[PDB]
């Protein structure tokens, strides 16, 4: 043909434009269609990406070559602290789209939520936001608005934010009433909370306003949203790399070595007519920091965090904590966690929003037996010889 | 063995039909025209052949 040879297209056309996303967390596009009936049951939940190990699973697949054999599998580990419900929204259906019918708020609001409505907290003397404390306006107002949500709004979503949690300053010894208290940050830094909104897929609408009002001003944990064996979609922003050449960005073949003005380029931008560069053509620009979803990530185990028996499995009868000895770029993980199979989008420290998958697998890998023999807790700097500190003294008890 | 009587049901639909010789398309065994617009409802039709 005219091309002179046939070879697939370089790079996907559906993930344009390849530019930066300014979202700090995974913005959810579309929630699963409500089954209707059943129970409302929350869907999405935020977890921070803590790090990564591998695990030695023992496999049970009938009619395959790995029947009753061991299989090493990489595992990301998202830390998930239990997050706090605050608000509640309706959404009326209209000809234009879904449009909102007012948010109700809780009785008080924690000052982690007040951070969101300032860029300069440290300057602010008044710090007056959410002054819904006045008794006459707030109490009367909610029962008016909660009536309007029964009338109009079909879809109902629950506003909720991450617990930054509280502490005592420096050398004051903690657990004492005279001491002034203050917000501890995350493993990142931040005290300002990640507010989301979470669709409740429970039938009747009216039924939802029992559940979403029962859940209001109470912390949610992970164990009553997801369950072990669930396929989960991980939504987040990927890993920023700045500007990039045409060769590395789109994965093209670089030119001959003999080229004047260098070879790290696509040679023909285009033909004479049309007299114009096309959108389709590969080109120099941003790489990474792209918002992405990824489908069908299994969760192997769910955590809790003095016994510290979470790291260890049924076998061995030795208790090992999940954090690898020495902790890189993160923190210990003294919270609920999720051993997700394989990769998850974004760097360490990033807020990933999890989500239940939109439609169901029929693949047998989806409904497999999980059974972990044994997990790595060696250090990542760089080659790790000892799984635990306990091993150390026994292996080399006398030092200096 | 097939059952002798029960050929006559199956051979009505499959075997005993007429066919165009431009469309190649299936028709009822007594038929003058071709239903399809392409080929201009060509009016030439043969019976379907008896291979063994």
């Amino acid at each position: 043909s005219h091309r002179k040879f046939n070879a697939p297209r370089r790079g996907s056309l559906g993930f344009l434009p390849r530019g930066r996303s300014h979202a700090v967390r995974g913005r959810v596009r579309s929630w699963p269609k409500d089954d209707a009936s059943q129970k409302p049951h929350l869907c999405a939940f935020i977890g921070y990406k803590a790090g990564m190990t591998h695990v030695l699973r023992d496999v049970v697949r009938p009619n395959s070559r790995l029947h009753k054999k061991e299989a090493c599998e990489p595992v990301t580990i998202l830390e998930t602290p239990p997050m706090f419900v605050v608000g509640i929204i309706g959404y009326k259906p209209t000809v234009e789209g879904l449009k909102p019918v007012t948010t109700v708020w809780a009785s008080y609001v924690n000052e982690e939520v007040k951070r969101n409505y300032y860029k300069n907290w440290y300057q602010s003397k008044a710090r007056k936001a959410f002054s819904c404390l006045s008794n006459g306006k707030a109490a009367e107002k909610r029962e008016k608005q909660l009536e309007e949500l029964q009338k109009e709004a079909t879809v109902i979503r629950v506003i909720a934010h991450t617990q930054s949690a509280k502490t005592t300053t420096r050398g004051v010894d903690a657990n004492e009433q005279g001491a002034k208290k203050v917000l501890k940050g995350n493993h990142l830094g931040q005290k300002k909370a990640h507010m989301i909104e979470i669709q409740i897929n429970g039938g009747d609408v009216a039924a939802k306003l029992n559940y979403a009002k029962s859940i209001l001003e109470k912390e949610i944990k992970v164990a009553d949203v997801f369950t072990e064996g669930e396929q989960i979609d991980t939504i987040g922003v990927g890993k920023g790399f700045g500007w990039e050449g045409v060769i590395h960005r789109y994965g093209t073949k670089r030119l001959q070595k003999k080229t004047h003005r260098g070879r790290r380029k696509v040679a023909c931008i285009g033909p004479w007519n049309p007299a114009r560069v096309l959108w389709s053509v590969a080109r120099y620009g941003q790489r990474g920091c792209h918002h992405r979803t990824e489908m069908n990530k299994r969760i192997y185990r769910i955590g809790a965090a003095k016994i510290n028996e979470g790291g260890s499995t049924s076998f061995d009868l030795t208790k090992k904590s999940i954090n690898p000895m020495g902790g890189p770029h993160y923190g210990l993980v003294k919270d609920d966690f999720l051993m997700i199979k394989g990769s998850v989008v974004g760097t360490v420290k990033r807020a990933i929003t999890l989500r239940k998958t939109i439609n169901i697998n029929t693949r047998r890998i989806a409904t497999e037996e999980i059974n972990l023999k044994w997990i790595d807790t060696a250090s990542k700097f760089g080659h790790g010889r000892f799984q635990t500190k306990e091993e150390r003294s026994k292996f080399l008890g006398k030092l200096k | 063995a097939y059952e002798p009587s029960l050929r006559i049901l199956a051979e009505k639909t499959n075997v005993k039909r007429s066919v165009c010789r431009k469309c190649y398309a299936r028709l009822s065994e007594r038929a003058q025209q071709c239903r399809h617009k392409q080929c201009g409802h060509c009016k030439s039709i043969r019976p379907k052949k008896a291979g063994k």
């Binding site: - | 097939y2 059952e3 029960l6 049901l9 051979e11």
Partner: protein
């Protein structure tokens, strides 16, 4: 059911109908009727047979045509491999 040698299994309660093992394939083919048109079989007296009946001729005879088109074999000559579910009679339910 017109066949030779591989035998055809069926399953029905009232409004619906199922396939297995036609021309040797394990896959199940299922047909759903409209409302007010009863599919039923009984293998004592009828033996390798299905009964469709109902009020409206448009909805009844649709289903008998719709059942027929599930059984069509491809990449094989239908003159030799003649096999399926063919319409035998077109009688009344209770002739008075």
């Amino acid at each position: 059911f017109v066949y030779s040698h591989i035998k055809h299994t069926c399953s029905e309660d009232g409004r619906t109908f199922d396939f297995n093992g036609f021309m040797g394939h394990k896959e199940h083919k299922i047909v759903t009727a409209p409302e007010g048109v009863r599919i039923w079989s009984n293998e004592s007296v009828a033996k390798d047979e299905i009964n469709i009946e109902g009020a409206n001729l448009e909805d009844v005879s649709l289903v008998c045509g719709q059942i027929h088109q599930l059984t069509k074999i491809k990449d094989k000559d239908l003159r030799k491999f003649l096999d399926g579910i063919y319409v035998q009679h077109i009688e009344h339910l209770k002739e008075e």
